[PDB]
Amino acid sequence: HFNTEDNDTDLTLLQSKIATEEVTCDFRVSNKYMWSASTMEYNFSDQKWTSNTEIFSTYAKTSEGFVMSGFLLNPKGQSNYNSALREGYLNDSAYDENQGHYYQCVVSDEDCNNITFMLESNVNVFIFDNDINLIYRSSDEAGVTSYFDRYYSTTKTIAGTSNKVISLGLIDGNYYIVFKVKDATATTGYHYGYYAGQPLPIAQTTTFSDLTHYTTIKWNRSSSSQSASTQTLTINCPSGSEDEYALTGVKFSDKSKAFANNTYASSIDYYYTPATASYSKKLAQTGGWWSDLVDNNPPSGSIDGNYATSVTVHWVSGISYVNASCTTMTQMTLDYLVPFGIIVG
Ligand SMILES: [Cl-]
C-alpha cells in the first residue's frame, strides 16, 4: 500500500533553486545530452494536451500494474516528445480502482535523472522509493533531501491554463509516481503531464557587442583578391557547467552597409572557426549584400571556447582607383540549447 495521506517525519520543505548563469565575452567540450543543431527545442507555449479523458488507460501496464515512465532522449522531432510524455485526467474511469494513477520511474544515469511535472489546479503528485516510502509530495513541495540532486519549481501557462511546473533530479534507483486529486468535488484542473529521462532542451540566444570580421583591407594595386584574419572571441560559461550548454547555430549580423564596399568589391567572403572545432568554415549569405552570415549546422558541443574569424575581399573587374578599400564588421549571435530546471527556469 502507497500511503500518501499520512505525513512523514523525514520530510523537509524543499527549496527551489536554479543557478544564476551568465555567458561572458572577451576579445573540445562535448554536450552531455548529445544535443545539437538537429535537436528539437521545448516550448511551453506549443505544448498541447490530448482532449481524451481516458488517455491514461491507453498505456500498457507492467506485470505489477504500473505504467512505465517515458524517456526523453535527445528529441529530434514531435514524435519523440509524444512518446516521452505521460499524461492523464484524474477524473477518468481508471482513477477509482486504486484512487490514483500509478507509474514506475527507473533512474540509472545522473545525466538522465530528470523528472519534469506539469500539474493543473486539482492535481497532487507523490514520489515513493523502492521500499514504498514517501520521498516527495508536490502539495507543499516536501521531501527526503538525500534522494535529490536538484529541485526547481515555477508556474507556466500551458494550453491556456496556469500549471505548477516542477523539475527535479533524483539519485539512481527505482521509484513510483502516484497522481492524486486535491479536492474530489472540484469542477476543473484534473490534467497532469510529465517527462522523465533528460531535462527539457530550452532554446537560448546571445549577441555579443564586440565586433568580429572587423578590418580595413586596402587594395595592394596588383592582386584580384585579398584576405585578412580578424578578431577571435572567447565565450565563457560559469565554471563546471560547460557541458550544460549545447551549440545549435551561429549568426553574424553584417554592420558594414554604410561603408558601401560594393563600389570596389564584387563580393566579400566571411569565415569563422566555431568553439566546437579547429577548422574554418565559410559562412552562408542568407541573401544579397549585407544579409546575415550563418552556420545553421555547427559541430556539436559547448558554446565555451574561441570563435576565430577571417574575411576575403574579391575586387571588382576593372578596379583602377589607388585608395580603394573595404571596411568589414559583423556582430555575433549564438543559438544554443540549455537544460530546463538546471540553467533556465
Ligand atoms: Cl546535427
UniProtKB/TrEMBL annotation:
Residues 206-340 form the DUF6947 domain. Residues 78-197 form the Carbohydrate binding module-like domain. InterPro entries: CBM-like_2 (IPR048759), DUF6947 (IPR054225). It comes from the Bacteria. Keywords: Signal. Gene3D superfamilies: 2.60.120.1420, 2.60.120.1430. This is Uncharacterized protein. It comes from Agathobacter rectalis (strain ATCC 33656 / DSM 3377 / JCM 17463 / KCTC 5835 / VPI 0990) (Eubacterium rectale).
